[PDB]
């Protein structure tokens, strides 16, 4: 039922925060930011488990690294395929071919990732996870310009 | 592997204002009246000049800086192509007269105008939210 105002710009401001700050601020319950950050490495296979796809990276805005979660509906889009859709795949060997292609385009697309990510982060058990990707854009720029020229 | 976050800075940051040397970098921010900042990777954007396999020059609004280990980094959108517009991650081997880095990831960044429009500001907002 507190908020420390203090830190409302810090944890806020428009286009995006960062990671240093936010873990500065030592967050005692889950709390969403927006960060411009790249992927750093990947830490893990990518999971089938449960029926959707999911799989652990670490990343950096610049001031520090962070170790994420990507979970189910960035991960389909990405490939192109759902779990079961891949599993259906296999019986079709053009199919599974497509879901191949997507499956490198995926490990492409995180290699090149470079963009805005509003990420859900759990100070209690140390990570967060991907809610959103965003490319950079106009409003952006101009949203930095403001909190850095007037 | 950096014990380093990659700091944003442009080449003149590493050309003018650091110290020290091989396994410790210091950035010094007299200026903004802060202490030395230190720091053993960053990350750096800027056009192809020119590539040759493994190495390559890039060139930031602030000045040139060159990388060199291309050959060992993960293969995204093939980006080592005079013009291009790119983001490096390395750790830094040298800094003066000219910024060298180890490179530990470079990606394209040519499909979107924003990127380079935005980099100074970037490096500029992030410098002033670091004691």
Request: charged share 25%; net charge neutral.
């Amino acid at each position: 039922n507190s908020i420390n105002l203090s830190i409302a710009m810090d944890l806020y401001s428009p286009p995006f925060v960062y990671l240093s700050v936010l873990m500065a601020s030592k967050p005692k319950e889950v709390t969403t930011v927006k960060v411009k950050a790249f992927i750093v490495t990947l830490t893990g296979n990518l999971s089938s488990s449960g029926g959707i796809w999911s799989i652990t990276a670490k990343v950096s805005d610049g001031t520090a690294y962070l170790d994420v979660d990507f979970v189910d509906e960035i991960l389909t889009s990405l490939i192109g395929f759902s779990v079961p859709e891949m599993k259906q795949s296999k019986k079709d060997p053009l199919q599974y071919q497509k879901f191949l292609e997507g499956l490198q385009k995926c490990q492409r697309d995180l290699i090149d990732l470079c963009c805005l990510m509003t990420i859900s982060f759990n100070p209690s058990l140390s990570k967060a996870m991907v809610l959103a990707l965003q490319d950079v854009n106009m409003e952006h720029l101009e949203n930095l310009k403001k909190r850095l020229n007037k | 592997l950096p014990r380093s976050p990659p700091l944003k800075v442009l080449a003149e940051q590493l050309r003018r204002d650091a110290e020290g040397g091989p396994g410790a970098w210091r950035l010094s921010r007299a200026a903004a009246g802060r202490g030395p900042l230190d720091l053993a990777a960053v990350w750096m954007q800027g056009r192809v000049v020119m590539a040759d396999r493994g190495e390559a020059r890039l060139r930031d609004p602030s000045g040139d800086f060159s990388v060199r280990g291309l050959e060992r980094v993960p293969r995204g959108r093939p980006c080592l192509v005079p013009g291009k517009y790119v983001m490096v991650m390395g750790v830094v081997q040298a800094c003066s007269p000219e910024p060298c880095l180890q490179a530990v990831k470079m990606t394209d960044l040519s499909d979107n105008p924003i990127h380079e429009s935005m980099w100074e500001l970037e490096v500029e907002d992030l410098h002033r939210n670091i004691p």
